[PDB]
Design a protein around this ligand. Sequence first.
Ligand SMILES: *[C@@H]1O[C@H](CO)[C@@H](O)[C@H](O)[C@H]1NC(C)=O
Lengths: 118, 48
Amino acid sequence: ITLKESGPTLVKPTQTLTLTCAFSGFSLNTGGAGVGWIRQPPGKALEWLALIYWDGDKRYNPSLKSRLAIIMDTSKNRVVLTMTNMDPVDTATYYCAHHKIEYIFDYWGQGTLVAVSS
Amino acid sequence: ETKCTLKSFTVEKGIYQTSNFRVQPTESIVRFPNITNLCPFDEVFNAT
Ligand SMILES: *[C@@H]1O[C@H](CO)[C@@H](O)[C@H](O)[C@H]1NC(C)=O
């Protein structure tokens, strides 16, 4: 199993974050499983970001609906996480992981860190 | 046996007859055909 995360290291406050995570090797004949994204900045604990299942459902934390978008390739290659109109406290690292319901996060990705250039 | 088959306590000379010589088996062997065309209960319990 390999899940690699790709993204910029420094971004503008008026830019858009375009993170990607690519997974290699899963049992696609299942239900309730999918791809999840979680955020971590230094100085405070973990904060969950988002979930996608295999059927294309698109969920985030509440009251963050406008500034979060997902692109699915529909070819089992990579998942794209896009943010607009950032907050400078969110200079943080990203983990993309497998997301089950009993396994809260099944396999942990390496993740990538980003900070604002302002 | 040659006394009990004549209901007598004395038996004369000569060749008589008794029960047969029976050989009994030991175990049972059942070989019906190899399983095939398994019914698709596996796909319906594992259905997405
Ligand atoms: C589902 O398939 C597995 C093998 O992947 C098998 O062991 C199991 O008996 C099947 N039935 C279930 C649990 O639905």
